[PDB]
Write a protein that binds this ligand. Sequence first.
Ligand SMILES: NC(=O)c1ccc[n+]([C@@H]2O[C@H](COP(=O)([O-])OP(=O)(O)OC[C@H]3O[C@@H](n4cnc5c(N)ncnc54)[C@H](O)[C@@H]3O)[C@@H](O)[C@H]2O)c1
Ligand SMILES: NC(=O)c1ccc[n+]([C@@H]2O[C@H](COP(=O)([O-])OP(=O)(O)OC[C@H]3O[C@@H](n4cnc5c(N)ncnc54)[C@H](O)[C@@H]3O)[C@@H](O)[C@H]2O)c1
Ligand SMILES: NC(=O)c1ccc[n+]([C@@H]2O[C@H](COP(=O)([O-])OP(=O)(O)OC[C@H]3O[C@@H](n4cnc5c(N)ncnc54)[C@H](O)[C@@H]3O)[C@@H](O)[C@H]2O)c1
Ligand SMILES: NC(=O)c1ccc[n+]([C@@H]2O[C@H](COP(=O)([O-])OP(=O)(O)OC[C@H]3O[C@@H](n4cnc5c(N)ncnc54)[C@H](O)[C@@H]3O)[C@@H](O)[C@H]2O)c1
Lengths: 265, 260, 268, 246
Amino acid sequence: GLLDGKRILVSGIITDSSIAFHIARVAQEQGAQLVLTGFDRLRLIQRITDRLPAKAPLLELDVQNEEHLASLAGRVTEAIGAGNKLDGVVHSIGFMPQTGMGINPFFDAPYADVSKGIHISAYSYASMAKALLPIMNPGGSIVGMDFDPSRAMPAYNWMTVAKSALESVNRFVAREAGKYGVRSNLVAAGPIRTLAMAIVGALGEEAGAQAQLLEEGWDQRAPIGWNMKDATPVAKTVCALLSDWLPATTGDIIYADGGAHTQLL
Amino acid sequence: TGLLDGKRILVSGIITDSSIAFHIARVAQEQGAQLVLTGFDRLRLIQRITDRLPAKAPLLELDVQNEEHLASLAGRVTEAIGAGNKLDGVVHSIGFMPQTGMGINPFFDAPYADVSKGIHISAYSYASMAKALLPIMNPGGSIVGMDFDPSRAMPAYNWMTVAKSALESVNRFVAREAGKYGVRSNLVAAGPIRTGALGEEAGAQAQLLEEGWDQRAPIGWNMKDATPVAKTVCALLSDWLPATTGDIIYADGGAHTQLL
Amino acid sequence: TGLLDGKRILVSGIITDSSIAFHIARVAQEQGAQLVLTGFDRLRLIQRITDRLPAKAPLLELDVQNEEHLASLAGRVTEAIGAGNKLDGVVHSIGFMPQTGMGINPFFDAPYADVSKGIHISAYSYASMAKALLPIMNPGGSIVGMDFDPSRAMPAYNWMTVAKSALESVNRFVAREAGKYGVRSNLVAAGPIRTLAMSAIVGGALGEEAGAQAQLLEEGWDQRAPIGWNMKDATPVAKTVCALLSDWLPATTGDIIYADGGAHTQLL
Amino acid sequence: TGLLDGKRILVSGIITDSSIAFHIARVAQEQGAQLVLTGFDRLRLIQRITDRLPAKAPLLELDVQNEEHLASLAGRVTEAIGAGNKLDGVVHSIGFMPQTGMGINPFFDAPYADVSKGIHISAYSYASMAKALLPIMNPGGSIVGMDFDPSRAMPAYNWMTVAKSALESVNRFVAREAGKYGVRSNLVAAGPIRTEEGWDQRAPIGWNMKDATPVAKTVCALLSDWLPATTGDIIYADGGAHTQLL
Ligand SMILES: NC(=O)c1ccc[n+]([C@@H]2O[C@H](COP(=O)([O-])OP(=O)(O)OC[C@H]3O[C@@H](n4cnc5c(N)ncnc54)[C@H](O)[C@@H]3O)[C@@H](O)[C@H]2O)c1
Ligand SMILES: NC(=O)c1ccc[n+]([C@@H]2O[C@H](COP(=O)([O-])OP(=O)(O)OC[C@H]3O[C@@H](n4cnc5c(N)ncnc54)[C@H](O)[C@@H]3O)[C@@H](O)[C@H]2O)c1
Ligand SMILES: NC(=O)c1ccc[n+]([C@@H]2O[C@H](COP(=O)([O-])OP(=O)(O)OC[C@H]3O[C@@H](n4cnc5c(N)ncnc54)[C@H](O)[C@@H]3O)[C@@H](O)[C@H]2O)c1
Ligand SMILES: NC(=O)c1ccc[n+]([C@@H]2O[C@H](COP(=O)([O-])OP(=O)(O)OC[C@H]3O[C@@H](n4cnc5c(N)ncnc54)[C@H](O)[C@@H]3O)[C@@H](O)[C@H]2O)c1
């Protein structure tokens, strides 16, 4: 397969609608040996990951928990046995409290909420690279999930700001990862109907309409179209970055959005 | 006629007479603006600095992390310019990142608590001030913030670069809200301004950036002079960029447009 | 004392009194600039237009594809402002792309002869203009060209988009050359302005479909723009050019200023 | 199984064994693609070069400035791949600028006729090759062109930089047309390959300007089905140098 005999960590699975779930599935189809991490509802997460092609160890990881991060590399090594290292890391984690999104005014989000969001959605990319780089092989690859924040838009609000921060964090992580012979990139995906997708049904009628408007305009703008209910094209893109087939790309963003961002109307 | 004749503009961020905000206020005054100034910590000390400005101006206390200062800010400004009057301009020239997040400390070594404080003061506060001051701004008004181009990574700037990226995104959103008021929102991205203390390596890094910046800039770059940056901000506060908002104007000698 | 008091500025691209160049010229004259104008083909018709400016100005002939017109322009400008006087500003508001590379014609069906002519006039000429006039410009001076944001593709604009992309790259290189003279070079990326050709297509002169895309482009532009966009008002763009011609943006060059309502900064 | 297993791919731009297109071709064949090659001037000479390719591939003639080559191309391709067969990928690895538009020669001194020829071969030809070949491409196919990041001005590269800026715009528009066929259009912006020393410096993973394989691999990635939602775009294979200021 594309990732034959590669040992790859995947964070971010919460349902079988999670982008990370599909990244995991495709990685396994492509021959990769996985270690998974989960936040909070690990009973649920375990049951969910049972439906993946192959069995995988599931580790606890709250990115805001300094102890989890500090014990993380050791718990992975045990999971994959001493002598072996990781070839890939997938950051598919995000969060922004309700006050920082939706119909709730941009100006009314408490800094505490915004800060919790940036910690989870942006700072933790660096946290995970820090914990995991010492157990990564050269030629390795760290990949995180992004949503093009280069332009403002309704509803997304402070999550946009967090992704803007994330992209900046990525460029710096690339500097550190390169010392290890490891690449660091982001996959900017178009809208995918995940857990929080959610806002289309929550963030306040109005925000929901705007989300639907965003979705609709995305499919039209994309020269090859965009669905939306299919996370597979995004998972394949992530896998492409984990493979040895983009070996000169780092600190960068690969857009798996149907080309929508390259078109105005 | 002065460029900002009759305009009423609030400037934050003056701490020394070397501060970018100090020269912005100076030029704005030379061009006829009526200023309200804000100050963070030692309010007595900056009063001494602000006394060296071309003309006297009200000095209001504003710690941007204190949500109480923010809630009362508009009232205290209206009291200063006299009730019945509003602001035509707001200048955000505030930035902070602890040494743990910039300079010599390894990028992975910055604790989030410090990063978070840095982001609050350097980016979120742009939204905070806008929230506080938009209800008392005139249509056609202008909010200007200070930026340092964070589109690419670089030595030392580290987490402040991440803050500046955050800020740019914040600026695009503030534009959406300021638009309801007829108000523009923009950032001025400035070249390096002189506002071995960090060691031999850091001193060489800084020298290399400065040399490289003047080298890269088609019209050169004078790190000793904040006057061109001040003037750019005054351009944005004026009425001569009326169709520009959510945007970034680069006052960097054009360095960012050139590879070598 | 106006923004541009005591400055000598060359303006190109006046063809009608609706031309962006016409509004730029008007506002510049209003701000105390001493203008020199250039004209391409209909030299006596444009004089009639240029006489509608608040101040009369020497109209010189310039076909940017005419290599001898370029070779003589500096001298003919000197003749109009008197020796010992130099130019402080230059406005390039010149654009052209044949209907084969723009509008309804399929992107693939534009012949290169047509595209090349478009790129010559719309992009290359920025550099040939700079080349001609730099040796008679004062330091601290300014050259500005008109742009339409080509970073993303869109219906109808087709090869004119390509030319503007080329123009943005040219401007970055012109900046390097002009820097040797203490001169800045910048573009103003304007939002869509109702030229007579723009009003015509909206009316339906390019057919029902083209007319629909036009409404859509304009309606969406004003929507996206946080401060809105009025396609019938070229004044905010003209002031932006004057800002750049002034000394108030002294450290900006090789760059693009967006006078577009902020639309380009907003996804929806 | 190969990455491009069973795929029919046209590859232009091979002139010597050091061409990006040579290694693109080389890596593609290693990944199980059946190739068609195209060459420009010295057809006999470049034929001797394609001999070294791991397999044999039918070599056709294509001057992108020649309307006749372009008009007959798809037919000459179908003839080589057999009726009933289409292409799955196309590689555009073509560039040219007359000396006066590059190097030491002043930016202002280059005649438009030189620039126009550069722009024709370097930028317009991407749409022209797409026009020709899309009617013979399978859905899910991929078109790839070679780019050098022109977003900032730089010494020496000069008018070639203007050509690349134009190419990036053309690519966005080709993607509109290609999408109608279910086909993607992307650019690979590669670092300097021998055909700045500060490039290896800025690159967080370094950069070896004698090694075209990583660039070649990136192109193969875009030709694969592993970047199925990317079009109108630019993929940087430059050691990440463009993401760092210093
Ligand atoms: N669905 C979309 O349209 C879309 C588009 C582009 C990018 N993204 C990004 O893709 C990623 C995955 O989100 P998703 O869309 O798959 O929905 P999701 O809810 O299934 O996955 C998000 C994950 O965040 C995890 N998380 C929250 N707090 C955490 C913590 N403190 N520690 C560890 N994990 C924590 C959750 O447990 C969850 O598994 C995000 O970073 C997101 O912003 C989503
Ligand atoms: N000096 C440069 O080269 C340069 C280049 C580009 C951008 N900038 C930006 O310009 C701006 C001003 O910084 P400077 O270069 O003038 O140095 P400076 O130290 O003189 O100004 C920074 C200001 O931050 C204010 N501040 C810190 N915490 C605050 C709080 N909690 N509440 C209210 N105010 C607070 C300080 O009081 C101070 O006046 C920043 O936004 C900065 O990042 C500087
Ligand atoms: N109308 C819009 O929406 C809009 C928006 C953004 C940018 N622009 C740009 O602004 C500029 C001015 O165009 P406009 O909108 O005012 O319409 P316009 O037709 O009034 O201006 C175009 C000018 O190019 C001149 N020109 C063509 N060939 C020439 C030659 N061989 N030599 C010398 N001059 C020649 C024309 O004669 C004309 O005056 C252009 O560069 C254009 O692409 C227009
Ligand atoms: N070498 C580098 O460092 C580098 C870096 C980034 C991008 N690129 C791009 O990669 C591609 C190939 O570059 P290269 O390094 O392999 O140089 P090269 O000399 O090996 O190949 C260039 C190709 O241009 C072709 N060509 C010129 N005129 C033609 C015409 N009229 N019709 C058809 N073909 C014609 C040549 O025949 C040749 O095969 C170009 O588009 C180039 O700009 C090269």
